[PDB]
Enzyme design. Sequence first.
Site, PDB file in Angstrom:
ATOM      1  N   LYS D 154       0.825  -1.204   0.000  1.00 45.50           N
ATOM      2  CA  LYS D 154       0.000   0.000   0.000  1.00 45.50           C
ATOM      3  C   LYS D 154       0.859   1.254   0.000  1.00 45.50           C
ATOM      4  CE  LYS D 154      -2.046  -0.974   3.738  1.00 45.50           C
ATOM      5  NZ  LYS D 154      -1.603  -2.333   4.125  1.00 45.50           N
ATOM      6  N   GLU D 180       1.034   5.768  10.989  1.00 44.62           N
ATOM      7  CA  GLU D 180       1.979   4.996  10.198  1.00 44.62           C
ATOM      8  C   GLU D 180       3.380   5.125  10.792  1.00 44.62           C
ATOM      9  OE1 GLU D 180      -0.262   3.007   8.878  1.00 44.62           O
ATOM     10  OE2 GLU D 180       1.089   2.855   7.168  1.00 44.62           O
ATOM     11  N   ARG D 181       4.368   4.617  10.062  1.00 48.39           N
ATOM     12  CA  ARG D 181       5.747   4.654  10.530  1.00 48.39           C
ATOM     13  C   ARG D 181       6.293   6.074  10.493  1.00 48.39           C
ATOM     14  NH1 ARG D 181       5.190   0.420   7.165  1.00 48.39           N
ATOM     15  NH2 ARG D 181       5.522  -1.678   8.008  1.00 48.39           N
TER      16      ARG D 181
HETATM   17  N1  LIG Z   1       5.463  -2.523  -6.369  1.00 49.13           N
HETATM   18  C1  LIG Z   1       6.356  -3.450  -5.599  1.00 49.13           C
HETATM   19  N2  LIG Z   1       7.388  -4.049  -6.194  1.00 49.13           N
HETATM   20  C2  LIG Z   1       8.199  -4.885  -5.517  1.00 49.13           C
HETATM   21  N3  LIG Z   1       8.020  -5.153  -4.257  1.00 49.13           N
HETATM   22  C3  LIG Z   1       7.013  -4.596  -3.591  1.00 49.13           C
HETATM   23  C4  LIG Z   1       6.121  -3.691  -4.289  1.00 49.13           C
HETATM   24  N4  LIG Z   1       5.208  -3.294  -3.366  1.00 49.13           N
HETATM   25  C5  LIG Z   1       5.513  -3.898  -2.207  1.00 49.13           C
HETATM   26  N5  LIG Z   1       6.547  -4.625  -2.406  1.00 49.13           N
HETATM   27  C6  LIG Z   1       7.150  -5.415  -1.366  1.00 49.13           C
HETATM   28  O1  LIG Z   1       6.217  -5.493  -0.198  1.00 49.13           O
HETATM   29  C7  LIG Z   1       6.991  -4.792   0.910  1.00 49.13           C
HETATM   30  C8  LIG Z   1       6.073  -3.972   1.711  1.00 49.13           C
HETATM   31  O2  LIG Z   1       5.919  -2.702   1.103  1.00 49.13           O
HETATM   32  P1  LIG Z   1       4.832  -1.642   1.810  1.00 49.13           P
HETATM   33  O3  LIG Z   1       4.123  -0.826   0.703  1.00 49.13           O
HETATM   34  O4  LIG Z   1       5.584  -0.682   2.752  1.00 49.13           O
HETATM   35  O5  LIG Z   1       3.735  -2.534   2.672  1.00 49.13           O
HETATM   36  P2  LIG Z   1       2.290  -1.985   3.202  1.00 49.13           P
HETATM   37  O6  LIG Z   1       1.174  -2.677   2.421  1.00 49.13           O
HETATM   38  O7  LIG Z   1       2.136  -2.285   4.654  1.00 49.13           O
HETATM   39  O8  LIG Z   1       2.212  -0.508   2.985  1.00 49.13           O
HETATM   40  C9  LIG Z   1       7.988  -3.962   0.244  1.00 49.13           C
HETATM   41  O9  LIG Z   1       9.148  -3.757   1.101  1.00 49.13           O
HETATM   42  C10 LIG Z   1       8.376  -4.748  -0.912  1.00 49.13           C
HETATM   43  O10 LIG Z   1       9.326  -5.764  -0.489  1.00 49.13           O
HETATM   44 MG   LIG Z   2       2.496   1.053   4.785  1.00 46.87          MG
END
Ligand SMILES: Nc1ncnc2c1ncn2[C@@H]1O[C@H](COP(=O)(O)OP(=O)(O)O)[C@@H](O)[C@H]1O
Ligand SMILES: [Mg+2]
Lengths: 487, 35, 39, 466, 67
Positions: D154, D180-181
């Site tokens: 997300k 969030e963080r």
């Molecule tokens: N578009 C992407 N391409 C490659 N890896 C991804 C992508 N989106 C997420 N990831 C992987 O999933 C992990 C979590 O990303 P994040 O967006 O911070 O999670 P959240 O859904 O909690 O926001 C990332 O560190 C990455 O390893």
């Molecule tokens: Mg997040």
Amino acid sequence: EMSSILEERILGADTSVDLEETGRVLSIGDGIARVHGLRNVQAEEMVEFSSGLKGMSLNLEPDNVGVVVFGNDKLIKEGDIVKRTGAIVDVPVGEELLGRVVDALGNAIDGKGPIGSKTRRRVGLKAPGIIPRISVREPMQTGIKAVDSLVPIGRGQRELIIGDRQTGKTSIAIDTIINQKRFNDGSDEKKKLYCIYVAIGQKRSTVAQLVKRLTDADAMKYTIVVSATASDAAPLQYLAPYSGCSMGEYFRDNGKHALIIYDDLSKQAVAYRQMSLLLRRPPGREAYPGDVFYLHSRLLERAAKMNDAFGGGSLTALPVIETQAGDVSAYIPTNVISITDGQIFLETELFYKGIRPAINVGLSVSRVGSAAQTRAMKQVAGTMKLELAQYREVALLSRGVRLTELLKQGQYSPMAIEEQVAVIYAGVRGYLDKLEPSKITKFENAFLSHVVSQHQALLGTIRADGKISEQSDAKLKEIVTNFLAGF
Amino acid sequence: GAGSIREAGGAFGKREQAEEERYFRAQSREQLAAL
Amino acid sequence: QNMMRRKEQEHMINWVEKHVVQSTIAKCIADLKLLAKKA
Amino acid sequence: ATGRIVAVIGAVVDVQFDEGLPPILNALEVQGRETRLVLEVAQHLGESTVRTIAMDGTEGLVRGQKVLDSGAPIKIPVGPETLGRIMNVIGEPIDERGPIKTKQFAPIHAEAPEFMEMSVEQEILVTGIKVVDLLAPYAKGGKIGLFGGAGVGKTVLIMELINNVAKAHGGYSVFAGVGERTREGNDLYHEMIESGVINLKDATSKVALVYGQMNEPPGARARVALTGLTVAEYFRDQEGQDVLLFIDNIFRFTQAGSEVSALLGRIPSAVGYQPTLATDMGTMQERITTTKKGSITSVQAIYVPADDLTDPAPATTFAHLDATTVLSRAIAELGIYPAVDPLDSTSRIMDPNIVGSEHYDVARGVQKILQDYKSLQDIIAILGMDELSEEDKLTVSRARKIQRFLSQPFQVAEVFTGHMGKLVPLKETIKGFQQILAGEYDHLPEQAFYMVGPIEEAVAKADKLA
Amino acid sequence: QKLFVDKIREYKSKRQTSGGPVDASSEYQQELERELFKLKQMFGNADMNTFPTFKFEDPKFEVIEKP
Ligand SMILES: Nc1ncnc2c1ncn2[C@@H]1O[C@H](COP(=O)(O)OP(=O)(O)O)[C@@H](O)[C@H]1O
Ligand SMILES: [Mg+2]
Ligand SMILES: Nc1ncnc2c1ncn2[C@@H]1O[C@H](COP(=O)(O)OP(=O)(O)OP(=O)(O)O)[C@@H](O)[C@H]1O
Ligand SMILES: [Mg+2]
């Protein structure tokens, strides 16, 4: 102008003062006011706060009255005066509400002035008993082939539209509302259907989009839109379905026919649960109050067909229910399914497989059935239903695929019953097995065009007689044979 | 759990019903012509 | 034209409301007299 | 008016007033604290006692401590002076750059726009993301919601959207970090300074930041979204601007309310949530809207607890959005990124009369073939691949190629993937998917469509494998 | 009769609007200009105070002659 504001806006203002019966707010919070005094207040009576806000007294208790606020509790403080209005909650009703967008209490929110309404009607009236009713015979035309053929709806019926999110429920309701324009401008008065759309807990821009769509097709001139959106107080979203049902009972009781859509009743159940939990009534299953079934049954029993002694009017109800992940077995879905006269089940798998509208003909039932169809539609649709069942058993097969791709329909395009009959005839007599399933759709369009260009006589015949005659059977037979030869 | 494949209505129950209906409609056509 | 009428009328209402607020024991006299007619 | 504290339970504080009981939603200041401790009145309890939610930590509060009434709700500075600055839930600067010297302050609690102010324009907003632009395209001035469980992408997707839309945006932008963080907020701040979108030396900044993060007590986490709304609403109404509002994460809002709902003395609803979940969410979300006075395009990341989309909070959020991008953990474990579920993401402008019959047909055909693949998945899992027909095998192969081609390398993901990001125009997406649906690439391997941009890169990767 | 005082006095005050366009406003232009901008731009882009001049086109046609 200094005349529209002073000729009678100030000259007539009801400046008189009265001896009011009042109470005093003991506490206020989350839209619940505990009120001291108000000794002679009635249950479900509308009271008024000192800041113009209105509320309904729901918990008559020995030491306090629990009032649900029809607005924001930000303006109510402890110690405010709460006046009686002496009346149980009621809304304006009449022909003057047609074309207007109103809120749950009947105030115009479309910026077009006051509704010139002279009649008022309670929102919690009792449904008609056994005697004033008569069997459901007149058909409620939706303009949707799958509905009008396999799940027919009569006038006075309660048909539930149940499905997941974004499966096409509001689309079915809006198609049904748009369809009634052919009858609402005609000369037959007993065929006109006045529509009512109740938006409960929706986004306000969604209701604006819907009103724009209804004004584009010129469907707003016979439609009342009651809007209790997501920012409205939970009492207003609780009360919107009953206000809409009263606006429709006005037509039901005057020999006219009305149609009401509750979009949707799950959000009304949520708002009622909020009110009950904040009134400190003990929770039940999924925290819903114990009488949520009563909530929906006392509402859906007010849709009825009346006999001749009571005018012959009707009120059709199309409640909408959103299920989670297809769980038809949930609390509120099973309640509303046990209440209504049939369901139209929509599916996400059917939606994405190209079947639009995504009606599940296996599950979708109309407890009234062929009793509320035209004879021509019944002739074609009994055979179409049999062949579609036989196709579902082995999914002959080419005829089944033909009928399936023939049940598909575009959006905001409700077809007339004669054109529906012609299309289902062309599909059920073999005139479509010579074509590949892919092209069927376009043929239909062309076909309709041809039939609505040079064959208005046969369509008018089917429309007036209601059934097809063997003469007109042969006429449409040769028309479709020639067109298939030319296609 | 007898008959639970057809009872679950999955991708295997639908194909089971299709198989039964195909076979027995073929058999019904074969039995009607010989009557 | 319609928009001009609407906004001008709204500001007229606002101004009249603001300006009547700026503008008597006869008030209390009539109030007591009407409370006498409360029956 | 001055009252005194009579009870402190977590973030909830009871205050007893001898005279002048403050209205509900008013802001009160606690006397005797080192920093500003603001209480927001939530309920009138009776006997001249109010119940309030604290916007900061309540440690050190003593029963009998004095509390002043401000006379108005929490008022934050609004204006062009907030651009490039960071403020917290109560409008105080947290970027150590001094006071935000606006000429006007707006309360964070306001009424939603009326029905006659709503707009109906539905022009598309191309994002450069193949799956979004193809299957669930966003609309300008609409409400976008990105659903997803923990660690599905997300934040990566919302940062990609900030990169692809906000820099190319003509108006202003507001980022509300909600629960969030904090290091993510630091990253965003410094990345926006590097990329010139925030300018520390003059008044050319284009983004306003409002942060209440997951280290904050539940009151701050419940009202920081409202603070961001107030900034965006000022930009939309008094400036007439077109605003971009990114909210990550909006679920925290609801969750924060849950955390206080028990202390406010309310009977819990389903899954322990407050009974007022839907009306609180509606009051908040109805202000996040485009009126006929200005436009707000909103991108909200929506957390899905335990990956359960039937949870009351995401299930209630679903009704407030014009476009939904539902990320899936199962798709993320297949290596496909972004993890958009193509049969769970919807849009209201996915309408032939809005996106064109070509776009509509390509999208609907892609979704049809993916649904057919999903229907076959059971037999494929048990009876193997060989027990299918020829058209079924062709459907499986094309559906797998389409699954691969829906993935895409992002520019925000370049750091931990090495693959340079791709911004695919809408026409190139429609063309590539039309071509795959036609069969023009039934001879290429499916690994050739994985993590590419346009279809030309797919054929180049195919020629590089062989 | 302070309601009638409101009526009469403020009628006679608002009627004193000869020398003023919008009855002693001293404001309400900063937002009215934005509103009129939006209204005009959503009704059109050209000058809406003069008659529209009409450019017209003629349908194309091909060599349909039998080859
Ligand atoms: N578009 C992407 N391409 C490659 N890896 C991804 C992508 N989106 C997420 N990831 C992987 O999933 C992990 C979590 O990303 P994040 O967006 O911070 O999670 P959240 O859904 O909690 O926001 C990332 O560190 C990455 O390893
Ligand atoms: Mg997040
Ligand atoms: N018969 C149809 N043909 C093609 N598209 C359709 C049809 N019906 C609906 N749709 C489209 O599928 C989407 C479903 O939206 P719709 O409002 O009709 O259903 P819904 O159940 O009310 O969704 P929700 O309640 O979550 O808003 C819409 O974008 C609509 O345009
Ligand atoms: Mg809907």
